[PDB]
Amino acid sequence: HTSPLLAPVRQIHAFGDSYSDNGESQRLTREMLAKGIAGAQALPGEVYWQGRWSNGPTAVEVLARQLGAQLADHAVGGAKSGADNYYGWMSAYRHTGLAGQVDAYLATLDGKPVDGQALHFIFVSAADFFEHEDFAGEQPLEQLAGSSVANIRAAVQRLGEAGARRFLVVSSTDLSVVPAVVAGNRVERAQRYLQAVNASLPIQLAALRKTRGLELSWFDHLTFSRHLRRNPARYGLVELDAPCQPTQPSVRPACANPDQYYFWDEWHPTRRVHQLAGEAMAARYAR
Ligand SMILES: [Br-]
Numbered sequence: 001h002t003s004p005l006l007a008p009v010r011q012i013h014a015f016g017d018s019y020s021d022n023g024e025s026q027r028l029t030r031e032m033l034a035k036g037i038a039g040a041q042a043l044p045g046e047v048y049w050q051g052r053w054s055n056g057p058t059a060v061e062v063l064a065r066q067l068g069a070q071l072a073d074h075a076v077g078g079a080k081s082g083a084d085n086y087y088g089w090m091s092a093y094r095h096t097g098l099a100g101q102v103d104a105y106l107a108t109l110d111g112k113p114v115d116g117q118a119l120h121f122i123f124v125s126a127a128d129f130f131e132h133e134d135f136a137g138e139q140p141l142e143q144l145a146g147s148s149v150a151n152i153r154a155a156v157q158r159l160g161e162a163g164a165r166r167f168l169v170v171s172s173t174d175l176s177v178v179p180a181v182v183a184g185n186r187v188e189r190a191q192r193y194l195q196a197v198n199a200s201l202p203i204q205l206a207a208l209r210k211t212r213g214l215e216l217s218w219f220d221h222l223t224f225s226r227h228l229r230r231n232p233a234r235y236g237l238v239e240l241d242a243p244c245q246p247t248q249p250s251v252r253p254a255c256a257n258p259d260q261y262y263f264w265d266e267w268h269p270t271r272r273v274h275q276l277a278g279e280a281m282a283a284r285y286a287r
Pocket residue numbers: 017018019077078079126127
């Protein structure tokens with residue numbers, strides 16, 4: 001039996017990665033390019049919509065629209081759960097990890113209070129796994145999962161310490177069906193990591209929610225994606241595996257019917273899946 005809906009939201013502060021970013025990695029990499037930062041690249045690049053790592057608005061943008069909230073979206077493509085980014089060359093200019101987004105948020109209050117009504121939305125960890133796999137991380141995946149969880153709990157604790165009261169924390173996505181993971185023959189590694197994060201994180205956050213009296217909602221993205229991928233026709237989806245916009249090994253022309261595609265590129269869902277996700281994320285909240 002469902003429980004009462006949480007109180008309405010008028011302001012969201014979003015922290016996370018390429019699954020939330022609504023223009024920060026674009027703004028930041030253009031600033032880094034203008035300053036000649038070593039190794040800087042224009043992200044996300046030309047085959048993406050208005051600086052989103054997709055062909056449309058991300059889930060949290062749709063969530064804000066659904067809830068009737070203003071959105072401050074601090075998320076940065078590649079952001080890890082700690083201080084830094086998949087893109088290691090960013091660290092010289094800015095710490096764009098979850099921890100760094102939290103630091104920058106709290107630094108820019110100007111000594112005004114945190115908005116205790118504002119929803120602090122956290123959606124991060126995929127970049128931890130991608131960096132570990134692409135650059136041959138030494139740690140066991142179980143340890144990496146442990147670090148991701150501890151990093152996210154530390155971020156919720158630091159935001160709450162500053163006066164945040166309301167949180168929505170997103171689980172690991174299903175990294176196991178990400179085209180790049182399938183192509184890298186890394187499906188079992190993705191399963192192990194995501195199951196370890198998604199088992200531990202809600203237990204760790206439950207404890208923090210109770211100690212601090214937080215309002216903290218957990219969005220199970222894995223259950224969400226399983227339901228889409230089991231019954232795609234229901235949602236008008238046709239292609240669950242092939243990217244609409246291939247980039248690897250090189251850019252090829254976009255598919256004709258992107259709203260019938262799950263994946264935009266080899267890592268990121270299309271605007272259609274982002275819409276369904278943001279609509280599903282809104283389910284715990286009164287409008
Ligand atoms: Br990412």
